Amino acid sequence: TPLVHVASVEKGRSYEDFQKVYNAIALKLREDDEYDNYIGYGPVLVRLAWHISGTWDKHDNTGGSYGGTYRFKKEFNDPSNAGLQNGFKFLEPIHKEFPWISSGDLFSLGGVTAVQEMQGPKIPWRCGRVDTPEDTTPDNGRLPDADKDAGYVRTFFQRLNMNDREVVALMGAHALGKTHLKNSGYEGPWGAANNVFTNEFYLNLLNEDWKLEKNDANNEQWDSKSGYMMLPTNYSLIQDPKYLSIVKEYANDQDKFFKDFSKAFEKLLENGITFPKDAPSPFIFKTLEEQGL
Numbered sequence: 001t002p003l004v005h006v007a008s009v010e011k012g013r014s015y016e017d018f019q020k021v022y023n024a025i026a027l028k029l030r031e032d033d034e035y036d037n038y039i040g041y042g043p044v045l046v047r048l049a050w051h052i053s054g055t056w057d058k059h060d061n062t063g064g065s066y067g068g069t070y071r072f073k074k075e076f077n078d079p080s081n082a083g084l085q086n087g088f089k090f091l092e093p094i095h096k097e098f099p100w101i102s103s104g105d106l107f108s109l110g111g112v113t114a115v116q117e118m119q120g121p122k123i124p125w126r127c128g129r130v131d132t133p134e135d136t137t138p139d140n141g142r143l144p145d146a147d148k149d150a151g152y153v154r155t156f157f158q159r160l161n162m163n164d165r166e167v168v169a170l171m172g173a174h175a176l177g178k179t180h181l182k183n184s185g186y187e188g189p190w191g192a193a194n195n196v197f198t199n200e201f202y203l204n205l206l207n208e209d210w211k212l213e214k215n216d217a218n219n220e221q222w223d224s225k226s227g228y229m230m231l232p233t234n235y236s237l238i239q240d241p242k243y244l245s246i247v248k249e250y251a252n253d254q255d256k257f258f259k260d261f262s263k264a265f266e267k268l269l270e271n272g273i274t275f276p277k278d279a280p281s282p283f284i285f286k287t288l289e290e291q292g293l
C-alpha cells in the first residue's frame, strides 16, 4: 500500500566509519568559515537536512530523507529549496571521499554535525537510508510557506506527525543563519548569535519590539529595532496560546529546549523509515573538540 522503506546498513560499515564522515564535515565547517559573511555553512546544512526530510507525507509514506532524492533535478530546483545548492556543493567533496555512504545518510548527517559543532545538543543518528530512483522524487510544493498563521503551521506539521511541542522546538532552529532576499524574498538575521545554537529565537520573539513592514520583494516581515527579522510564520507562535506557553518555557529553560529539539530533530530525520530489530542502535557522534581534533 504505502511504500515501505526499510533501513539497510551500508555494507560492512560500523560506528567508526560514520564518525569519520562526521569529522570530515566538521573539519570542513571549521575551515570554510567565510561563507555568507562569516556565518559558515552550519545553518545551511541544517536547513538542508530539514528540506530533504520535510517532504514526508504520513498518508502514503512518500518523501522524507530515505531516498536522497534531492540529488534529482526536480527536487533540487524546487523554488522552496533555493539556496540549498550551497550546502550541496559543500558536501560533494566529502561524498567523493566516502563514496559508500548513501545520499540520504550524508544529507542528514550534515545537519546533526552542524548542530553539534555549533554547540547544540547531541542528536542520535541512525544509518541506513538507501538511494531511490529518480521516479521516487516527490513533486514540488510539499515545503511550507512563510506568510501564514499558526493554524497553517499546526495543520502543515501534522502531515509530518509533529505535535505542538515538536513544532515549537523545531522552530528554534531559526536562531541560526538568516533570510536572503534572492533566495526567499525575505531579508535579515533572526538575532545576534547566528552560528551558535542557543534559545535566542524564543527570547527575541518575547523581548523585541516588532514592527510589521514590507520588504524590497514586497513581502511582509516583522522587523525589530535591533535590526532582526521574523517571518510571519515565526511570529504566529506568539499569536497562539498553546504555542506561546511553549515559547515561554524555552525562553526560560535552554536545557529543556535542547532536549525537546534533539528528539524532534531525530524524529524529523527518521520519518518514513522502518528500522529492523537487528539494526544498530542510534549513534551519538563525538565533536571535534571531544576528540581533541
Ligand code: HEM
Pocket (backbone or CB within 6 Å): 043, 044, 046, 047, 050, 082, 083, 144, 145, 146, 153, 170, 171, 173, 174, 176, 177, 178, 179, 180, 181, 182, 183, 184, 185, 186, 231, 233
Ligand atoms: C513553517 C516552517 C518553516 C518555514 C516557513 C521556514 C522558512 C524559512 C525561510 C523562508 C528561510 C530563509 C532562506 C533564505 O532566504 O536563504 C529559512 C531559513 C532557515 N530555516 Fe526555515 N523555515 C521553517 C522551518 C524550519 C525548520 C523546521 C528548520 C530546522 C529545524 C529550519 C531551519 C532553517 C535555517 C537554519 C535557516 C537559515 C539558513 C541560512 O542561513 O541559509 N526552518 N526558513
